[PDB]
């Protein structure tokens, strides 16, 4: 049984993409609690979302075998984390969010599309940024 | 221009499943950073993962028109949120990470397999937990 190219495989990814989001989402139902002044839901909230951290960076530690589900790339060290990332980020920039830009524009969401760009710059922001961690990485 | 149904609500899905995974890649690879002693580099990853939540949090307002990416149910406010929570946590206990347990099982990832065995029943304790918290909510 190796974990390349197994259904297992793509579980775990289809997992930590759910208690990714999970996490995201509990925090933001948090937030709606703390305006509405339940206090003892936002912290069930905030409680859960670490639960689903903890999920999520298990599930993450089985994919280290088989590369980073954002990228493919190999993860571990920093040199390898920063590298995916920049791969990641750049892919956001140059390709995911100026599509959605555009799509999103030709639909008539002018406020969203302007939206993904504002991402989109503030992804090439952090790809450019960890290019300079990089370059300057001892290890 | 209706969003439900569009194709900007289908990138707003994607873009926020992505965002989610980005933010807890990202601390993960801090953590690494942490231990190998490169602070800084580990100051840098929970910085941008800060920013990961944001676009995330501004993904998801954005579709609290259409409703949850978890569910389909609408969000907003607390009796909302935790509904939508529990329905997804239902899913995820009696159906999601008992199939995956058992491919696990199938393939010869035993560890795994209990890893989503336990995950199971994680969840069905997270989704009683937030059934109890809905019946004492008084909005
Ligand atoms: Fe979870
Ligand atoms: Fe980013
Ligand atoms: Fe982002
Ligand atoms: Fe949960």
């Known amino acids: 049984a190796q974990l390349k190219g197994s259904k ?12 990714s989001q999970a996490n995201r989402r509990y925090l933001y139902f948090a ?18 979302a670490e639960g689903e951290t903890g999920h999520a960076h298990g599930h993450l530690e089985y994919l280290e075998a088989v590369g980073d589900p954002a990228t493919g790339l ?3 060290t920093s040199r390898q984390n920063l590298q995916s990332a920049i791969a990641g980020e750049t892919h956001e920039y140059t390709d995911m969010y100026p599509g959605m ?3 999103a524009r030709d ?7 302007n939206w993904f760009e504002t991402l989109a710059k503030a992804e090439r922001s952090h790809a450019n940024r960890y290019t300079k961690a990089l370059d300057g990485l001892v290890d």
């Open 107 to 113: 639909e008539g969401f002018e406020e969203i599309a």
């Open 31 to 48: 937030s709606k609690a703390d305006v509405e002044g339940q206090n003892d839901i936002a912290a069930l909230f905030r409680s859960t």
């Open 8 to 19: 297992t495989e793509e579980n775990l990814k289809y997992a930590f993409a759910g208690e």
């Open 74 to 76: 190999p993860f571990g």
């Open 101 to 103: 830009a555009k799509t």
